[PDB]
Design a protein around this ligand. Structure first.
Ligand SMILES: COc1cc(=O)n(C)nc1-c1ccccc1Oc1ccccc1
Length: 109
């Protein structure tokens, strides 16, 4: 059911916020600070920013009809990171480590 599915999504996002993954998850906790040095072009490249705190707020406001809608925002968050940064950037390796956590849980729910 969609209700149980969404409860599982909340559980996946709670693990993504956990201390276990904090060493690589922290760039994704809050919206990208577009005022920070080096990020002056973020809004020109990334048309739909997304982060974990925004996804948590959307789950709380019932903005996802189902797990597929939630999963689309988590994957949008990673895709933004892959699109914006050079492929060898430290933040892309962190996105991949976090996406490993997400994909494994999302597949097994
Ligand atoms: C290029 O900076 C980013 C691109 C991006 O896609 N995200 C999601 N966040 C950032 C970012 C923003 C502010 C501070 C640090 C940041 O990440 C870094 C992580 C490791 C090394 C350097 C930067």
């Amino acid at each position: 059911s969609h209700m149980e599915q969404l409860k599982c999504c909340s559980g996946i996002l709670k693990e993504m916020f956990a201390k276990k993954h904090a060493a690589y998850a922290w760039p994704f906790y809050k919206p990208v600070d577009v005022e920070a040095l080096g990020l002056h072009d973020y809004c020109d490249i990334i048309k739909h920013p997304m982060d974990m705190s925004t996804i948590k707020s959307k789950l709380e406001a019932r903005e996802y009809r189902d797990a597929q809608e939630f999963g689309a925002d988590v994957r949008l968050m990673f895709s933004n990171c892959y699109k914006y940064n050079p492929p060898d950037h430290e933040v892309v390796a962190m996105a991949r480590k976090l996406q490993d956590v997400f994909e494994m849980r999302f597949a097994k729910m």
